[PDB]
Design a binder for this molecule. Sequence first.
Ligand SMILES: OC[C@H]1O[C@@H](O)[C@H](O)[C@@H](O)[C@@H]1O
Ligand SMILES: [Cl-]
Length: 295
Amino acid sequence: GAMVMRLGDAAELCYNLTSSYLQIAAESDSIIAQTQRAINTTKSILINETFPKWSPLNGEISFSYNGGKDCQVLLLLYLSCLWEYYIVFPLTKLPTVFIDHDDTFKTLENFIEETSLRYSLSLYESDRDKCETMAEAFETFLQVFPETKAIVIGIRHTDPFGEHLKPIQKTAANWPDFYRLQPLLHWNLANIWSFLLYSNEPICELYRYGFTSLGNVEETLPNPHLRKDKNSTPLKLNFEWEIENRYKHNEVTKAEPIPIADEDLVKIENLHEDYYPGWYLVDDKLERAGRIKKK
Ligand SMILES: OC[C@H]1O[C@@H](O)[C@H](O)[C@@H](O)[C@@H]1O
Ligand SMILES: [Cl-]
């Protein structure tokens, strides 16, 4: 039982849940309203600024997907926009690129594979056993796919190296030559959680265990700001409505969380502490707080 959707069905599903999110009744000072505004900006970037210039069909656009929450939100919106642009289906699998590393969480590896099957992506993975820079990995990716003109990148202004980015932007001089398409820059952490929880799509289950940012296995811990302690003020949930009223699937689109990898549960159990899930954090400045101390 691996949930598989043909690409067209996946795109239609994402259009429907995104449209449904946009129809949520919310007050003007709410996280949900702000997320609706962020969705509309993302849609404009893709439908108005991107697709008229580069084809998402003929190989001109590839999607950089690393299984994390930002990439996942962006993929859902990208699929929604493919449906909206072309219908509102000419493609069997969507070209996707993952830069793999030897210190990636096993649960994240599993999730990338699961989601590649779920959304009928055509996954290319760089070689995790090659010692090389990201630019080098993409240079090899361009040699395999020389038709690529632009790459969709799930990154936010609050992320490291996010400050001086724009929605459409050529790569650095030491990269292969393509346009970076960066339609998620204006999203905040709270918007990410709101949309992702409402979508009722499977997400990387590490977030459920207190992780807020998935760095590498050696550095990354559950966020200490989410550690449960009788002597700390309990944390309040900002996404109760989204969870309780999350998008209802049909028979063609049913979903289930996949449990974390055994090796990751062992690492979590060894901490002898419990954490609120990642969506109890909404402060962007503390997103990467869960880290091993280094000099
Ligand atoms: O304007 C950005 C891009 O738009 C595309 O439709 C053109 O074919 C490219 O030559 C150009 O770089
Ligand atoms: Cl993350």
